[PDB]
Design a protein around this ligand. Structure first.
Ligand code: 5GF
Ligand code: 5GF
Ligand code: ARG
Ligand code: ARG
Lengths: 781, 781
């Protein structure tokens, strides 16, 4: 039995006393509130909040039976007897405590509304709506998973509801979530220890909800543009010669390549026994500085793997112990335990000593030429209960280990190279880890169609809760004895339309596309080149993700927020604003039914126009593509393919506009900067191109403009080819800034025409110079 | 009747007095002699000699009836009565005067040996052996020529004999050559005026003959590497917008492009009336500095056309007259005459005033950003007899006008940009013009199969007499009403294997490959890319041409100097040392008979091995290639394709070696420098890679090395893939500098293998790092 006794309102937090203790409420924004139970006691700090100490001014009002603590849009309604808090946006109930907080173990119980659908929990393969499921909150490997998992590498103690709120359990400890499984109408959060707090974030739409969520948990800094390029990876290159041979293979096979990734053989010849060496195995990598410099000359970055563990057999054991860098046992000695790789300890990233020691090693390797970092096994993969960290035992801090590891490395990289954007790829984190630039991948997926078929669900679940660059080991990682060629092709095709292009797998079967047969390469080469040609599209989506948290992959349900049934879809998704992608995830599929939203759509590959009032579209499949539809009104921007983003230029732009009278107004943008300055957005050192189309019965008008302060090397004038798909055959003239130009009606492909209409393709091509001043192009019948 | 009277031997020239006057003999080298009749009188200087005043020490010996003036290898035997000079190499008679020199008009008569075959005269379409022909020495347009011409743009007063000598008529005047036509056994040279001299050069082989010839007439300076890239050209881009649209089309169609060429519309909107303006038509080219700068940003050079003529209607007429820059009439007034383009005069490049005036204009335009120069109509196309130049009348200097024009422009460009290599493309020159960097093309060829079929004969005739970069308007230039697609494709395929890749034609039919249909582009795109991938092969041949005069295209007859019948062949030729090319020059050809020299040959496209003891090889044709055979023992070097040579890198090399036991020793080289320094060779600022193969019964050994001082940006270590074609399946191991490496026998395409044998292709691939130290690779059975 819990009831209200008293409250204090200073400041600007609400402190409530019940018969059971203190509760602190603080608005972290107009749309987000942090609720801390046991506010009286000492406990772990928030990990989820980007600014834990902030508290914006709210209004408090009191009545006989209730308190009301209200921010801009979000209101907390506090019922005095029995004590229960409920949350409202406008006058709409979002979420209500049932029993709410209960003590010893930590326990939060909320009511769920009938029909309420619940996404969340991070990586699970359970269905998009996780209501009716119970699962642990304990980051844990799931080697070789395929089509089901209740527990994987990167769980999140957070949910997103069809009521358009996000609830975060701001707790790092071994726990569990019960989403109306045990009791149909109860959401239960549990933890063995740790912080007893939750955060509720509201929004008026899913995009606004995600914007509000990332406002308080952190926005991802724009990654280096090279993160969007082609990665060479396997587990693992065995030598410098093999690594050099692989870079060379990309050159001789004419596949783009930005980055090569070195797995654990860079520090030892065996899988076991060397982890912790954190230094080059000179028997097999004899000249690593020259190797990295030679790669940089070819525009290729080098990324190295690192892990939390230092083995007793490794060259750094004695030094780590001496430095007090490792987690301890209750006795105060370094804790050693049996990992797959051997007996070893874990670097205590929560301590000053561990952080300084580990950071110094990253600094040294980075000075040698390492461009980015891969942090594997950060669950931590093995984490005995009696392990003691500076701020708590293993079970208490477990789900924040990887998160703090990312923070440490992010801070380190920014201190060493304040003019570069850190690249940090990790397997396990916490709510908010995106603010440290964490780029997660979905772990050791099996080489099965089931493994591929689960990737959209996983990506969308992580994308919705803050992680825009979630991606998979393309082609599959685990086991297998011979390449499943059709599966591999489908996986690398899908790869083009998801955040990071990194084929990776155990090296008994090649993961890199350059080591495939002629048919496979003939299919994938123009697709990897397409990835590069589409960099302006992808990099602009990245820009929007940094600005607003908008994920690069968006679920189908964004298309109609009043149709909750769409939430179940995990087979079609949006890549940026304009492309509806439906990966092929079974062998031999001859056609697909695409649940395209009501409107006009074009076949990305064939230009075919489809119109639908709601009924799904049936498209035939082929081996060389996967089904992709373009939304009418889309501006799709391209640059010429380059081999590496170091050579990226937009002196030449080609933009495809998908015209249809059903879209009388359309807008596009292209974000351009130097691809590397971490401060480009803050300082406005960018070139933001905007395009607006106005489509009426007798005219199609485009207004082009540029804003921003520009940047070093920005082209003053871009040669631009605008291709208008589904263009009327009735346009008689073009005005460019008032100057009339005839539209040629033949030989469009065979003359340097400035305006020409191709009657067979229904395409109207305009070629012009896009300089710094506004440009108006008007087509008139 | 002529007879010897007296001689003086100082110094070191021989001066002979006959009853008719003085004759001066001077060795210009051990292998070349200049013979000047009327040595007593004042006459035009030599144009053919690079060092006219030189005279090396020779030996003179006298007998009752003869004088002997002897250099290293060449000896002049002077018969006293009747007077006649004959020339010997060793004790072999090369050439004997008949009546020799006869006066008023200039006339030289020599005996021809029975069976002696005679190439020469420069551009004619008459058959490789011109014996039995008579033709004028008067540079003259032959618009729309096809399969026959006795008189074209670029005649040369020179012949090459199967006796392995070259005879030059060192005379610039309107004349004629009668090669045993009128009198079966007489070679007659005639001129209306000008210098009465000839030069005889001997050699012990055709390569040595050409080396000796270019030693005394001039060696071509290495062109900028960009000269070997893709040119966009037509007659003509009508505006800046059209020019920008064409550069953009190369970008959007993914064809390489180094240079765009602007025809006469850059200075006026009409073909007639504007010539002489030598300045931008701002109505149609409003921002030419920005245009050229924008192209440079994309790695694209701009070349402008210029002509010798200044029209009275042009903006520069009054100024040219004021400056005394134009040729005059006998009265002393500027000479004006009716050209196709209108009434106008000719710039007197032979005068100080004309040279200074014209040079100042090139300087100004070059400062604005023009990268190279196209000089059209230098015959001069129209040249009235009464026209007076500073050094003689039109008929006297005619065939040296273009030559002096090139010298003027070359000197100008070197003075303005001493750190760049001039690019000078012209239609008409003289013996020796190559020393001013002249790059000639074969004029206004018709768009017919006949026009294409004549190009090998023309190229070989010019190549043998000093002009390595002779080439054609690819696809054809003149007339036509609709594209002959098959002809166009064949012409641009041949284009890949001849010196300069410049499609060009009258613009009612597109000349650029980017304006062609999908099938045409699908065929040509990978071929234009091949051109770029083969830059190390082509640029190395260019290097050899600068060193020794060795032409890039070599005739079949080089393959067997004891088989004079080969001289007639004008259908197959060598592109560099290793490729035997047979262009397809008729429609619908289904197969070809290739007269491959005795030995082992491989199909360049299919890898098929052929062996022949002399009988021709029959190969089937296809539309996507033309027949090319690779000589056994060839090292064919490639780099990855780039869009422009400004991006050229050899960090990655791929080298194909064509192994056969019939070739126990083979050598290759790759010349690398910065692609732009005119002094790179002289100063040894280059990286010369050498490869040697030793092929025995049980071993194949490669020795790799580098010499030269290197250059700025040179890669220290190149990733190298060596592909050995027709490799034995019996090699069991590889030693690289003594370190043994196993040869994998499977999965060569699908692993980062360092050594692997592909049993299905009979190819053995080695991948390694080629650094600055010598490298030995040994394969052993
Ligand atoms: C962690 O472990 C590895 F298997 C070996 O380092 C990686 O290759 C794998 O991608 C990652 O999950
Ligand atoms: C000279 O005249 C032109 F026809 C016009 O300038 C050129 O296009 C042609 O290539 C050249 O022979
Ligand atoms: N994280 C997981 N859900 N792991 C499931 C592992 C199941 C497997 N049979 C094992 O015990 O090893
Ligand atoms: N240089 C030449 N061979 N020209 C031949 C031109 C022939 C042509 N019938 C004419 O008189 O115009």
């Amino acid at each position: 039995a819990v009831f209200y006794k008293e409250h204090k309102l200073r400041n600007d937090g609400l402190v409530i006393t019940t018969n059971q203790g203190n509760i602190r409420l603080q608005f972290k924004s107009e749309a987000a509130i942090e609720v801390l139970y046991r506010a009286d006691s000492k406990q772990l700090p928030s990990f989820a909040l980007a600014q834990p100490e902030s508290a914006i001014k709210a209004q408090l009002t009191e009545t006989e039976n209730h308190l009301q603590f209200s921010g801009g849009t979000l209101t907390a309604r506090i019922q005095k007897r029995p004590f229960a808090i409920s949350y409202y946006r406008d006058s709409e109930l979002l979420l209500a405590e049932e029993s709410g907080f209960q003590v010893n173990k930590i326990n939060f119980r909320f009511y769920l509304s009938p029909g309420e659908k619940i996404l969340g929990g991070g990586q699970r393969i359970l269905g998009m709506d996780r209501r009716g499921q119970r699962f642990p909150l304990y980051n844990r490997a799931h080697y070789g998973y395929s089509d089901h998992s209740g527990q994987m590498y990167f769980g999140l103690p957070a949910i997103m509801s069809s009521k358009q709120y996000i609830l975060v359990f701001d707790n790092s400890a071994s726990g569990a979530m019960d989403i109306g499984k045990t009791e149909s109408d109860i959401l239960q959060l549990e933890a063995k220890s740790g912080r007893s707090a939750y955060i509720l974030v509201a929004g008026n739409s899913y995009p606004s909800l995600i914007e509000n969520f990332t406002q308080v948990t952190g926005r991802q800094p724009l990654p280096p543009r090279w993160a969007l390029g082609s990665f060479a990876s396997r587990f693992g290159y065995r030598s410098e010669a093999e690594t050099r041979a692989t870079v060379q293979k990309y050159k001789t096979e004419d596949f783009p390549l930005d980055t090569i990734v070195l797995d654990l053989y860079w520090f030892g010849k065996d899988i076991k026994g060397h982890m912790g060496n954190l230094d080059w195995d000179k028997e097999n990598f004899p000249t690593p500085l020259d190797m990295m410099a030679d790669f940089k000359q070819q525009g290729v970055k080098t990324v190295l793997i690192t892990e939390p563990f230092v083995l007793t057999s490794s060259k750094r054991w004695d030094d780590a112990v001496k430095a007090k860098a490792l987690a301890k046992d209750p006795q105060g000695q370094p804790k050693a335990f049996e990992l797959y790789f051997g007996n070893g300890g874990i670097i205590d990233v929560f301590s000053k000593e561990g952080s300084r020691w580990f950071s110094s090693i990253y600094k040294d390797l980075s000075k040698q030429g390492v461009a980015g970092w891969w942090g594997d096994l950060g669950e931590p993969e093995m984490h005995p209960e009696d392990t003691q960290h500076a701020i708590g035992d293993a079970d208490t801090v477990h789900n924040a280990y990887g998160h703090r590891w990312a923070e440490m490395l992010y801070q380190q990289q920014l201190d060493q190279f304040p003019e570069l954007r850190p690249f940090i790829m990790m397997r396990a984190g916490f709510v908010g880890s995106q603010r440290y630039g964490m780029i997660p991948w979905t772990g050791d997926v099996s080489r099965t169609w089931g493994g591929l078929a689960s990737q959209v669900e996983l990506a969308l679940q992580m994308s919705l809760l803050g992680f825009g660059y979630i991606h998979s080991d393309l082609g599959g990682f685990a086991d297998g004895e011979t390449l499943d060629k059709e599966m591999y092709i489908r996986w690398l095709q899908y790869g083009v339309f998801q955040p990071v292009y990194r084929p990776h797998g155990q090296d008994h079967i090649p993961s890199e596309p350059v080591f495939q047969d002629e048919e496979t390469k003939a299919i994938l080469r123009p697709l990897v080149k397409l990835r590069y040609r589409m960099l302006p599209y992808i990099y602009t989506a990245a820009y929007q993700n940094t600005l607003t948290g908008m994920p690069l992959m968006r679920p189908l349900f964004f298309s109609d927020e009043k149709n909750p049934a769409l939430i179940d879809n995990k087979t079609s998704y949006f890549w940026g604003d304009s492309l509806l992608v439906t990966p092929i995830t079974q062998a031999g599929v001859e056609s697909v039914s695409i649940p395209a939203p009501k409107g006009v759509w074009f076949d990305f590959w064939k230009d075919t126009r489809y119109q639908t009032d709601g009924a799904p579209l049936t498209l035939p499949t082929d081996l060389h593509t996967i089904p992709v539809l373009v939304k009418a009104g889309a501006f799709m921007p391209y640059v010429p393919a380059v081999s590496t983003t170091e050579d990226y230029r937009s002196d030449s732009l080609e933009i495809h506009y998908y015209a249809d009278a059903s879209v009388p107004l359309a807008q596009g943008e292209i974000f351009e900067d130097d691809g590397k300055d971490p401060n480009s957005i803050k300082r406005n050192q960018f070139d933001l191109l905007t395009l607006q189309a106005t489509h009426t019965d007798n005219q199609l008008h485009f207004q082009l403009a540029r804003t921003g302060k520009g940047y070093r090397g920005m082209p003053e004038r871009r040669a631009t080819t605008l291709v208008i798909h589904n263009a009327s055959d009735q346009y008689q003239h073009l005005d460019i800034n008032g100057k009339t130009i005839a539209i040629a009606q033949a030989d469009c492909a065979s003359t340097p025409a400035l305006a020409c209409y191709d009657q067979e393709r229904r395409q109207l091509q305009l070629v012009f110079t896009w300089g710094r001043e506004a440009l108006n192009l008007r087509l008139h019948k």
